[PDB]
Amino acid sequence: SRYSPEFKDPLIDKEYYRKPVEELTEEEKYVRELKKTQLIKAAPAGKTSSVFEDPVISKFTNMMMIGGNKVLARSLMIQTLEAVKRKQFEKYHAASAEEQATIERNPYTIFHQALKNCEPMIGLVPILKGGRFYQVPVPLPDRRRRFLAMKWMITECRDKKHQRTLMPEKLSHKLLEAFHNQGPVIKRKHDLHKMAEANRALAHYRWW
């Protein structure tokens, strides 16, 4: 749709092309690429070659936006980031010395650790054989499990709410609990794992 075939993907990294004179293979590759110079697609309104961002954060912000409200999702992301920053600094300045020295204040590492901890390991499928749906554990790639964990966190922060709760500080507290290996998303992950383990005698029904 509005883009022909044999077209490449818009690049994002810049330091790789700032001095591409290392060896010969990539040199010949980029020379042959720039010879015929095909019509490269334009950069969308969401990607930036800056070093003060992260592709995972951009993907999470794009997934958070419901409908057409990029400014709303951006404001919510900025509020969540400043909230976790303020909470980290408040728990840092209100401590002793060993705790302040053994912990960091970078929210990116905390968010990455929370994502790696809440990421599942096995998945069940309702295989319809003979008229019944039996769960069979099947392997899943890394990106699929990451997307599943992200959507689980999103739906937990969205659906699970009462009336007096908010949203930025709520998500901040949820991320802080998930980083400490004690969170509701981790509880759901453990429940799914024990449910798959309770039905481990159905692996012979798989065909791939």
């Binding site: 810049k14 700032r18 334009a42 950069a43 309104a45 969401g46 930036t48 070659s49 800056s50 990029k70 400014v71 951006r74």
Partner: protein, 66 residues
């Protein structure tokens, strides 16, 4: 007396722009006379306009007035 003067056009998603890139000013963007801060309150447009100047490692030495 227009040193480092150049113009261009552009048409995408029903939008016409005529940027005037200079190589002798600071690092600001003027949109229809006034600066881009009053016309682009969202950081999205600011990042979209900073991406070309960032890809060439030239920020505080190029001034534009589109």
């Amino acid at each position: 007396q227009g040193m480092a003067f150049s113009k261009s056009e552009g048409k995408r998603k029903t939008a016409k722009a005529e940027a005037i890139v200079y190589k002798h000013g600071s690092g600001r963007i003027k949109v229809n006379g006034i600066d881009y801060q009053l016309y682009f309150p969202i950081t999205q447009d600011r990042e979209q306009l900073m991406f070309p100047f960032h890809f060439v490692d030239r920020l505080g030495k190029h001034d534009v007035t589109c």
